[PDB]
Design a protein around this motif. Structure first.
Motif, PDB file in Angstrom:
ATOM      1  N   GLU A 110       0.852  -1.261   0.032  1.00  0.00           N
ATOM      2  CA  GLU A 110      -0.129   0.090   0.185  1.00  0.00           C
ATOM      3  C   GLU A 110       0.749   1.316   0.191  1.00  0.00           C
ATOM      4  O   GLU A 110       1.124   1.721   1.078  1.00  0.00           O
ATOM      5  CB  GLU A 110      -0.986  -0.115   1.171  1.00  0.00           C
ATOM      6  CG  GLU A 110      -2.023  -1.094   1.077  1.00  0.00           C
ATOM      7  CD  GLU A 110      -3.104  -0.656  -0.077  1.00  0.00           C
ATOM      8  OE1 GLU A 110      -3.081   0.523  -0.048  1.00  0.00           O
ATOM      9  OE2 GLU A 110      -3.529  -1.490  -0.611  1.00  0.00           O
ATOM     10  N   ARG A 111       1.414   1.718  -1.148  1.00  0.00           N
ATOM     11  CA  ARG A 111       2.273   2.672  -1.462  1.00  0.00           C
ATOM     12  C   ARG A 111       2.100   3.892  -0.634  1.00  0.00           C
ATOM     13  O   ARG A 111       2.996   4.153   0.248  1.00  0.00           O
ATOM     14  CB  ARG A 111       2.595   2.916  -3.022  1.00  0.00           C
ATOM     15  CG  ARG A 111       3.681   3.937  -3.193  1.00  0.00           C
ATOM     16  CD  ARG A 111       3.778   4.103  -4.592  1.00  0.00           C
ATOM     17  NE  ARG A 111       4.650   2.584  -4.945  1.00  0.00           N
ATOM     18  CZ  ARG A 111       4.644   2.487  -6.352  1.00  0.00           C
ATOM     19  NH1 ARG A 111       3.920   2.900  -7.236  1.00  0.00           N
ATOM     20  NH2 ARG A 111       5.300   1.342  -6.647  1.00  0.00           N
ATOM     21  N   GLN A 112       1.050   4.431  -0.778  1.00  0.00           N
ATOM     22  CA  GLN A 112       0.713   5.946  -0.152  1.00  0.00           C
ATOM     23  C   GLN A 112       0.668   5.682   1.294  1.00  0.00           C
ATOM     24  O   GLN A 112       1.132   6.480   2.030  1.00  0.00           O
ATOM     25  CB  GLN A 112      -0.423   6.432  -0.852  1.00  0.00           C
ATOM     26  CG  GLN A 112      -0.420   6.572  -2.214  1.00  0.00           C
ATOM     27  CD  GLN A 112      -0.403   5.264  -3.130  1.00  0.00           C
ATOM     28  OE1 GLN A 112      -0.850   4.363  -2.521  1.00  0.00           O
ATOM     29  NE2 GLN A 112       0.375   5.414  -4.178  1.00  0.00           N
ATOM     30  N   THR A 113      -0.256   4.471   1.885  1.00  0.00           N
ATOM     31  CA  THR A 113      -0.163   4.445   3.330  1.00  0.00           C
ATOM     32  C   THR A 113       1.281   4.037   3.767  1.00  0.00           C
ATOM     33  O   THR A 113       1.518   4.860   4.965  1.00  0.00           O
ATOM     34  CB  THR A 113      -1.156   3.320   3.711  1.00  0.00           C
ATOM     35  OG1 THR A 113      -2.537   3.587   2.852  1.00  0.00           O
ATOM     36  CG2 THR A 113      -1.281   2.939   5.126  1.00  0.00           C
ATOM     37  N   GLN A 121       4.108   5.355   2.745  1.00  0.00           N
ATOM     38  CA  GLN A 121       4.855   6.546   2.882  1.00  0.00           C
ATOM     39  C   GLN A 121       4.338   7.598   3.891  1.00  0.00           C
ATOM     40  O   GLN A 121       5.238   7.912   4.806  1.00  0.00           O
ATOM     41  CB  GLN A 121       4.777   7.251   1.352  1.00  0.00           C
ATOM     42  CG  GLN A 121       5.157   8.647   1.630  1.00  0.00           C
ATOM     43  CD  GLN A 121       4.896   9.762   0.414  1.00  0.00           C
ATOM     44  OE1 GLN A 121       3.680   9.815   0.325  1.00  0.00           O
ATOM     45  NE2 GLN A 121       5.829   9.875  -0.711  1.00  0.00           N
ATOM     46  N   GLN A 122       3.022   7.629   4.268  1.00  0.00           N
ATOM     47  CA  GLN A 122       2.374   8.281   5.237  1.00  0.00           C
ATOM     48  C   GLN A 122       2.801   7.975   6.759  1.00  0.00           C
ATOM     49  O   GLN A 122       3.258   8.681   7.398  1.00  0.00           O
ATOM     50  CB  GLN A 122       1.049   8.275   5.136  1.00  0.00           C
ATOM     51  CG  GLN A 122       0.300   9.697   5.912  1.00  0.00           C
ATOM     52  CD  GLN A 122       0.155   9.234   7.307  1.00  0.00           C
ATOM     53  OE1 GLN A 122       0.536  10.282   8.103  1.00  0.00           O
ATOM     54  NE2 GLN A 122      -0.137   8.276   7.848  1.00  0.00           N
ATOM     55  N   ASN A 141       8.348   0.963  -1.653  1.00  0.00           N
ATOM     56  CA  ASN A 141       7.582   1.434  -0.901  1.00  0.00           C
ATOM     57  C   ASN A 141       8.219   1.688   0.499  1.00  0.00           C
ATOM     58  O   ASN A 141       7.865   2.802   1.163  1.00  0.00           O
ATOM     59  CB  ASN A 141       6.095   0.545  -0.525  1.00  0.00           C
ATOM     60  CG  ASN A 141       5.592   0.641  -1.957  1.00  0.00           C
ATOM     61  OD1 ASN A 141       5.668   1.340  -2.907  1.00  0.00           O
ATOM     62  ND2 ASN A 141       4.647  -0.160  -2.072  1.00  0.00           N
ATOM     63  N   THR A 159      10.414   8.238  -9.843  1.00  0.00           N
ATOM     64  CA  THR A 159       8.938   8.304  -9.679  1.00  0.00           C
ATOM     65  C   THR A 159       8.718   7.128  -9.526  1.00  0.00           C
ATOM     66  O   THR A 159       8.849   5.989  -9.896  1.00  0.00           O
ATOM     67  CB  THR A 159       8.443   9.310 -10.926  1.00  0.00           C
ATOM     68  OG1 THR A 159       8.500   8.459 -12.109  1.00  0.00           O
ATOM     69  CG2 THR A 159       9.181  10.643 -10.953  1.00  0.00           C
ATOM     70  N   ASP A 160       7.183   7.250  -9.291  1.00  0.00           N
ATOM     71  CA  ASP A 160       6.182   5.799  -9.095  1.00  0.00           C
ATOM     72  C   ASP A 160       6.308   5.346 -10.598  1.00  0.00           C
ATOM     73  O   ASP A 160       6.583   3.975 -10.901  1.00  0.00           O
ATOM     74  CB  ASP A 160       4.799   6.084  -8.952  1.00  0.00           C
ATOM     75  CG  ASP A 160       4.780   6.184  -7.367  1.00  0.00           C
ATOM     76  OD1 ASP A 160       5.648   6.283  -6.495  1.00  0.00           O
ATOM     77  OD2 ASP A 160       3.316   6.418  -6.979  1.00  0.00           O
TER      78      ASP A 160
END
Lengths: 230, 230, 240, 241
Positions: free
Chosen positions: B62-65, B67-68, B116, C99-100
Motif C-alpha cells: 500500500e504505497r501511499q499508506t 509513505q504516510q 515502498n 518516480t512511481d
C-alpha cells in the motif's frame, strides 16, 4: 577449550584474525614461516587476553615437515577445533613474463598449503566430536581474475573450489567450511564503491563471525569483504 | 541511539532478527501486516531486553499508506539508521497454471515492498550523518530458481539486483547494502549437506552481523545461509 | 518449419536476432510495441531471406491484449517452437528521485512481460512434441547492479530468476530456457553517464555490436545447444 | 589465411569431438595426446578426411621443458596457433582423508601446470599473428560448486577458471578472447550404476550429456561470431547448476 590454528598470524590480516578469535574466547595457536619474535609477540597478546597460546614455525609448502610438526602439536595439545588458512603469496607480472618460480611458488603456497596443513588435522578435528570450523582466505582476484595475476588468480580460485568440495565432505560431522575473499586491504580506490582500502579488522571480523557458533548454518560459501568491488 | 526497522517482525525470521538486533544494542521498531497483538508481544520483549521499541502496521504493497506512516514515524522518532527488508509472499504452482494474483502479488510484495518502504527512508538515513545499514531478505530460489516458483524466484532474484544497485548508490554515504538468502528454514533434506532445516536464529545471526559496525567493509553482497545447499 | 517469436524485433538487438534466426532456417514472427511500418520492414527482410514472417503489435504490459493476440496467432499459425523475450525499458535516476512510473514501468515491462508473453505460449510449445527454446534478454546490470538503475537492475535480475526456475519446470519437455545478458551494446538507449562508466571498464574497450549479441541467442536456439539450460550467458566484452 | 588450433587431449572423448567440430568449421586442427599415439593418428586422418590439415603432438602436459621444446619446434615449422583449447585433464577421486600425495599433486598439476606449460610458449606466437585469437579451457561443474570425493579436482578446475578470467583481462587488447567451458556429467565419464542413478535425479534433463553437446559450445566460442564473449565460464550441464 576449543583451539584454532591461524596460518601466517604473526602480522597483518592473520594477526588480526588471531586476536579477534582470542577475544571471542578461543585458544589460538599462532604460526609463521620465519619471523619468530613477531609470532611470540602475538602469543603474548593472546595470553594477555586470558587464553592459551603458543606458536608453530613452518613453511606451508614443506609437506613432510608440516605433517610432523602438526602431528606432534596435536599429540601435545589436542586436536584443533578450527583452522584458518590465511597464509598466501603473490608474484605479480604479465603472464608471458612470469618465471617458473613466479608461477610455482604462488600456486603451491595456496593449494599445497591447503593439503599440507589440513590433511594431518581433519581426523583430530572429527575426533573432538563437537563440529568444527575451517575458513580459507581467498581474494577478489580468485573470483574475477586480475591483470598481472594469472598465477595468483588461479591459486586463489583453486582455494574456492577446494573449500566448497571439502564443505560437502565434512557437513555430516558439523564442520563448516567457508572462504573469505578480501578486496584491497591496507596491508584502484576509484573502482571501490566505499572509496577506500579495507582495514585488517574488517576482514578479521568476517572470519571471526564464521568461526562462531552463530554461523552454524553457513557452509560452502565465499564471503567477499571488498568494499563493493564486486 | 541508532534505530532499525525490521519488516514482518511479529514472528518467524523477522522476529528473531528484531530480538538479536535489540540484544546487540539497537532500538528496534517492529512491523506487521495485521497481527497487532503478536507485534505488541515482540515490542514488549525488546523493551524487556532494555531497548526502546514500538510497532507499525501496514501492508507493504500500500504505497501511499506506507509513505504516510513512515514519514510520520520519522518525524516523531527520527530517521532509521537501519532497515531490514523481510517482505515476501509465496504463491507456488506450475507456471502456465499460475493465476494473475499468484504472479502479481508475489512480484509486488517483494519488489514494490522494497520501493515502498525504502524510498521514504533513504534521505532520513543519510541525514543522520553516521552511515547506515540496509539488509534485504531473499532466498536460495532467487539465486538458483525452483520448480513451482517462477514467480517467487523472479521476485527474490529481483531483490538481489535492487540490493546490489542500491549498494553502489549509497556507498559514498557509508551505508552498506547487503542481502541474506536463506535456504530451507524451520518456519517454511537429502539435498542439504548439513542434513537439516535451518533455525530462525541461524538466519538472524547473519543479519545481525551485517548490521554491526564490524561489517563496515561488506557491501553489495548476497550471503547465503542454507546449510550448503548451494 | 519451426517458428520463433522475437519481441521488440523491429529494430536494434531484437531485429538482429530475428534476422539471424531466419538465416538459420527458422520462420520468425516479428513484434513491435507501436512502430508498425518499422515492423513490416523486418518482415519483408525475413521473407526475402526465404522464411515465413508476419508481425504482431502489442504493448507487453497489456496482459489481456497480449493473451488474445497470441492465442489468435497460435490458432492461425501453430504453436511457437521458440520465444525470445526482448522486453524492457530504462527510466534512470537516483533511487530517492525515481518516480512511481520510473519504478513501475521498468519492473513491469521486464517481469510482467515475461508472464504476459510466455504464459499463453508454454502449452502450445509443449504440444509441438519436439522440445523448444526460450531465451530471455537481461543485462549486466541485472547481474551486478548499476548506479542510477536500481529499478532496471531489479527488473533484469528478476528476469534471471524467472528464467532459471522455468528451465527447471520445462527441462523434461526438452525445452531449454536460458538468459543472455548483454553489456554495453550499440543501438541500446543508455544515458551518457552509463555509457562513459561502462567504456572505461570493458576489457575489449568498445561497445558490442548487435550481431555479437544476436549470435549468442542464435546459438542457444540451435539444436546443438541442447544440453545448455538454466544458464545466464554474458555478452559484455569482459566487463564481468 | 587458414587458422590453426591446438586441442589438448583430442585423441578421444570430448577433446576428439572438439577437434572434429573445429575442423568442420574450417580450422586446421593439431591433435594432442599424452601417450596413445595410434589413437591420435586416427583423429588426424579423420580431420584430414574432413578437408583440413592436421598432425599430432605427443606430450605429458606436466613435462614443462619437453612441452616448451615441442611447441616451439611446432610453431617454427607450422606457424603460430590462432587458437588453443585446453581440454586434457585428470581425476584421482577419493575422500579428502583418503587421497594420496599423488592423487592430489597429479590432479592439481595437470590442470594448472598444464595451463602454464602449454600457453606460455604459445601466447606470443598467437599475438604475432595480428588477427586476434581464441583460448578455451575445459573446467567442470565441480570447479564451480565443488563435489564430494573431488576436493582435488574441484580445486584444479576452479583454479583453471581463475587463470582463464585473469588471462582474458591481459589479452583483451590483442582481440584474443579467453573463456572456459564447464561440462556437467558427460557420457565419457565412467560412473557406477549407483552413482549414475543418483546423478541423473539431480540433472534437470535427467540424462548425461553427449560429447558433441560440449564440443558445440567450444566450437561456438572459437568462431568469429563470439568476438564479444570473453572472461566467461559457460556451463554445459543439463541444468545441474
Amino acid at each position: 577449550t576449543r583451539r584454532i590454528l591461524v596460518t601466517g598470524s604473526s602480522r597483518g590480516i592473520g594477526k588480526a584474525i588471531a586476536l579477534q578469535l582470542a577475544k571471542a574466547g578461543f585458544d589460538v595457536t599462532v604460526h609463521a614461516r620465519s619471523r619468530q619474535a613477531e609470532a611470540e609477540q602475538v602469543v603474548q597478546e593472546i595470553q594477555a587476553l586470558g587464553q592459551n597460546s603458543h606458536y608453530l614455525m613452518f613453511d606451508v609448502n614443506e609437506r613432510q615437515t608440516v605433517q610432523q610438526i602438526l602431528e606432534q602439536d596435536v599429540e601435545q595439545h589436542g586436536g584443533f577445533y578450527g583452522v584458518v588458512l590465511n597464509a598466501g603469496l603473490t608474484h605479480d607480472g604479465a603472464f608471458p613474463a612470469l618465471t617458473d618460480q613466479d608461477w610455482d611458488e604462488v600456486i603451491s603456497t595456496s593449494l599445497d598449503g591447503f593439503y599440507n596443513v589440513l590433511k594431518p588435522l581433519i581426523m583430530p578435528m572429527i575426533h573432538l566430536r563437537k563440529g568444527g570450523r575451517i575458513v580459507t582466505l581467498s581474494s577478489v582476484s580468485g573470483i574475477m581474475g586480475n591483470r598481472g595475476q594469472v598465477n595468483y588468480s588461479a591459486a586463489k580460485a583453486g582455494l574456492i573450489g577446494a573449500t566448497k568440495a571439502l564443505a560437502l565432505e565434512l557437513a555430516k560431522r558439523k564442520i563448516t567450511v567457508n572462504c573469505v575473499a578480501p578486496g584491497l586491504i591496507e596491508t584502484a580506490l576509484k573502482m571501490i564503491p566505499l572509496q577506500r582500502m579495507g582495514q585488517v579488522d574488517e576482514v578479521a571480523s568476517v572470519v571471526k563471525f564464521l568461526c562462531s557458533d552463530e554461523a552454524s548454518y553457513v557452509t560452502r560459501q565465499v564471503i567477499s569483504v571488498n568494499g563493493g568491488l564486486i
